[PDB]
């Protein structure tokens, strides 16, 4: 409930979705989309935020 790391596990094969994350200093939440089942798997994604 304090860190800056999320741990995501996909439950279905091809059902896709989206997520909203609000940070400590930001007012605009950052929304991301999540696609499973590709020819590559992102083991870890690093995100640079503008502020």
């Amino acid at each position: 409930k304090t860190s800056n790391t999320l741990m995501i596990q996909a439950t279905k094969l091809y059902n896709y979705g989206n997520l909203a994350v609000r940070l400590r200093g930001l007012n605009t939440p950052v929304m991301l989309t999540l696609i499973p089942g590709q020819k590559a798997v992102d083991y870890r994604v690093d995100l640079r935020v503008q502020g």
């Binding site: 896709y16 696609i35 590709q38 020819k39 590559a40």
Partner: protein, 63 residues
């Protein structure tokens, strides 16, 4: 010139990224700069057909 790579593909859409880092999303009939008109999106095997004859794929060490 600019080279585009497939980031994600479902039936219908395809999300592409360029060598400049710009990201786009396309459907069956859509405009792509420097390539022409999209003719067919093939979700299996990761191939996109273009009106100029080009095929859009994944990066080879990133696929």
């Amino acid at each position: 010139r600019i080279i585009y790579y497939i980031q994600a593909v479902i039936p219908g859409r395809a999300w592409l990224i360029g060598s400049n880092g710009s990201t786009l999303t396309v459907r069956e009939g859509s405009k792509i700069p420097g390539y022409g008109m999209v003719k067919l999106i093939d979700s299996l095997q990761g191939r996109i057909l273009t009106s100029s004859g080009q095929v859009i794929k994944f990066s080879q060490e990133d696929s």
